[PDB]
Paper text:
The first step of this pathway is carried out by a [name] ([name]) belonging to the fold type I aminotransferases within the pyridoxal phosphate (PLP)-dependent superfamily. We have solved the structure of [name] [name] (LiTAT) covalently bound to PLP, providing a structural basis for its enzymatic activity. The structure of each LiTAT subunit shows the typical fold type I of the aminotransferases, with each monomer having two domains. However, unlike other aminotransferases, Leishmania [name] is not able to transaminate dicarboxylic substrates and its preferred substrate is pyruvate.
The N-terminal domain was too disordered to be modelled in full-length LiTAT, but its deletion in LiTAT_truncated did not affect the overall structure of the protein. Indeed, the best resolution (2.35 Å) was achieved for the LiTAT_truncated PLP-bound structure. The asymmetric unit of the crystal in space group P3221 is formed by two identical polypeptide chains (A and B), forming a homodimer that is also present in solution. For chain A residues Ser40–Lys448 could be built, while for chain B only residues Ser40–Ile439 could be built. However, several loop regions (Asp62–Asn63 in chain A and Asp62–Ser72, Glu363–Gly367, Lys382–Ser393 and Glu404–Glu405 in chain B) were too disordered to be modelled. As in TcTAT, the N-terminal residues (Ser40–Ser47) of LiTAT_truncated are involved in interaction between subunits. In both subunits of LiTAT, PLP is covalently bound to Lys286 in a cavity located at the interface between the subunits, although these cavities are not adjacent in the dimer. However, residues from both subunits participate in the stabilization of PMP and their disposition is similar between LiTAT and TcTAT, although Thr184 and Tyr345 in TcTAT are replaced by Ile221 and Phe378 in LiTAT. Since the hydroxyl group of Tyr345 is oriented towards the internal aldimine, replacement by Phe378 in LiTAT may affect the reactivity of PLP with the amino donor and/or acceptor.
Residue numbers in the entry:
A (entry chain B): 40 to 61, 73 to 362, 368 to 381, 394 to 403, 406 to 439
B (entry chain A): 40 to 61, 64 to 448
The structure:
């Protein structure tokens, strides 16, 4: 015979509730489903050129190709309204990752040990909770106030901070809330992080996907010595999540977080980096994508916002991202044939996440069915 | 002011000795000749098949494969890989034991290694790993607080596993036996009989066998590759492989793992690996479809070209044996590397493989890798995949270098 082989504690406690939960589907967080949103043609053709050259099939540096890091550094400068802020973004502090999902893993596991906690918004993109449970880090939720435009309850969060608290995480613009934070509110967050002396992690992957001529405020656009780790990429706004490319950018002017940066660098060695074809294709086109491409998608999202309004169930209208928030029992009865998502999944019972990114013809039929 | 932010223990102990090596610039006027590089794309002499390249083109232009794949891999590629590995099995039953349900698509074999070990072991466990070895097993183990417990390969018995010594290393915390076959850095290609013995060893000790078979297509001299798949056994085996080396595209970051477990004693291991793919959420969707379209269509001819190039590189290293300069070596039967054994008693001022590496580089601007990096001092890893003109020139400098330091 042969002794049964069991798995590790690490594997056993690694759970993704969304995926575990798994016809008109308003539950899907992937902009490629219908084809109404499209990757820019120049990116598609840069990929064609790059793979046909045969010059980008070799090993990249595990931290990312130099030129893509440089380009990403240059690209994020546009979110900075000032020269000093812009100069504070250095390519040396850019890391290319296998999607933002990996950037989250690297950020959290280079920073925390088992037994630590981080403060994370609720409701939230579930990956932070999943990564935390996987590695024995506590995901300590602070709550977002839906009646104050889904702003962070900074009064409450203060009471959650202790000696094992290692970071403060925000998602802005937000999946699942569709929120877009004001400049003053982002300033408060930074001050909060200063008062409590913890780094700020800002998931800014929807940066290009603000609606209604809204203003996006990146944690980069401030004069502060508070270390900030910005996570972003092209997966959502260039409609190519399956390419598995994203990045993290550290802004640390007084250099208080250098070991974190080194730790993240060292940990890229484990899977040894990112698809070399996509890295070069994005390095060639990231700065050349015209406002019009981002402007077509934003208009397409504004349409979905209009369709959900007919239901008015209450809701805070979306200012950004691809979702609106409007609980488990309601979800189950709808399928028995429309698919929504319960906010339970995201850390806040009593809501439903619905997607804005599908065609009106699909949405209208589903909103009517609701 | 602001509290200094420090890193985790996991980060602090994560080290890759190869990268770290990257070395004093040479005080020489000769051209830099690098024999240290483990990337088949370096010179352009070896080539990704055109049919794979044009499948990538069709796939990306379609705009139908830019979405999220399943974290475990696209269904069609998993089915295709399963079908592909069947050719390494000589029988219907062995072929039937390969199931696409037990294939996982990974971000290179490097991720496959992470998933295999961290889904199996807890901190405080150990695994048996060959030395010398591709450094990633050691790097991942140390990163995760798993002990990399070396058993030694024998350069005089064709770089075979010393199984007798390995037996004394097994204890209650030993969780796996790792082999690399064909081998980086040794160039060895195991006989069927040795692979049979390795499996028997794993049966006696009741530990799973992990086999890095990424050089499966790159056997030389009409050799026979024996996959751990090609056996009638209930020993659980996890095979790591991919297209990175033999289709000359390591940078695309695609590889896979295949679990073969006929009595289903390792289902939890499989479920664990699957769960852990959720953390980076999978693999480049363009390449998975491109490879799904072409993996079964690539002609034998594309590979025999690469093999021919490697056999020629091997002949050039053989020239080192014609001079009495203290270099012995088992000619490579596979993979892309050779291990040069140093007779240190030949040299007046060369104490170690490391010192040999430094002085060679400083004096002749030829870069090899000391075997220390791979877990076995007293050797040098040299690459066979470069063009003959590069190798021939570099071997001349090595010969000259040895004669000069002798006595
Ligand atoms: Cl990782
Ligand atoms: Cl991973």
């Amino acid at each position: 015979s042969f002794r049964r082989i069991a798995s590790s504690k690490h594997a056993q406690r690694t759970l993704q509730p969304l995926n575990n939960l798994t016809n008109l589907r308003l539950s899907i967080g992937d902009p490629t489903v219908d084809g109404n949103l499209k990757t820019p043609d120049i990116v598609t053709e840069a990929m064609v050129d790059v793979v046909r050259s045969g010059k980008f099939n070799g090993y990249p540096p595990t931290v990312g190709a130099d030129n893509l890091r440089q380009v990403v550094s240059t690209y994020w400068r546009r979110f900075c309204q000032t020269k000093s802020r812009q100069e504070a973004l250095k390519w040396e502090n850019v890391i290319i990752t296998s999607g933002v999902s990996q950037a989250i893993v690297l950020a959290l596991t280079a920073l925390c040990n088992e037994g630590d906690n981080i403060l994370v918004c609720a409701p939230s993109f579930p990956h932070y909770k999943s990564v935390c449970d996987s590695y024995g880090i506590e995901c300590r939720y602070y709550y977002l106030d839906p009646s104050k435009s889904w702003e962070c309850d900074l009064r409450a969060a203060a009471g959650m901070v202790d000696s094992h608290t290692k970071a403060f995480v925000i998602i802005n613009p937000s999946n699942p809330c569709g929120s877009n934070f004001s400049r003053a509110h982002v300033s408060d967050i930074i001050d909060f992080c200063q008062q409590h002396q913890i780094p700020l992690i800002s998931d800014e992957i929807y940066a290009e996907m603000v609606l209604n001529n809204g203003i996006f405020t990146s944690v980069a656009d401030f004069d502060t010595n508070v270390p900030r780790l910005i996570l972003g990429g092209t997966a959502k706004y260039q409609v190519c999540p399956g390419w598995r490319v994203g990045w993290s950018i550290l802004i640390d002017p007084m250099n208080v977080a250098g070991d974190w940066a080194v730790g993240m660098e060292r940990l890229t060695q484990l899977i040894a980096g990112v698809n070399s074809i996509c890295q070069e294709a994005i390095a060639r086109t990231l700065l050349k994508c015209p406002t019009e491409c981002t402007e077509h998608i934003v208009t397409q999202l504004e349409a979905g916002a209009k369709v959900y309004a007919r239901l008015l169930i209450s809701m805070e209208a979306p200012q950004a991202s691809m979702f609106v928030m409007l609980d488990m029992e309601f979800y189950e009865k709808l399928l028995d044939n429309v698919q929504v998502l319960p906010g339970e999944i995201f850390g806040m019972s009593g809501f439903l996440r619905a997607t804005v990114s599908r065609p009106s013809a699909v949405l209208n039929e589903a909103v009517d069915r609701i």
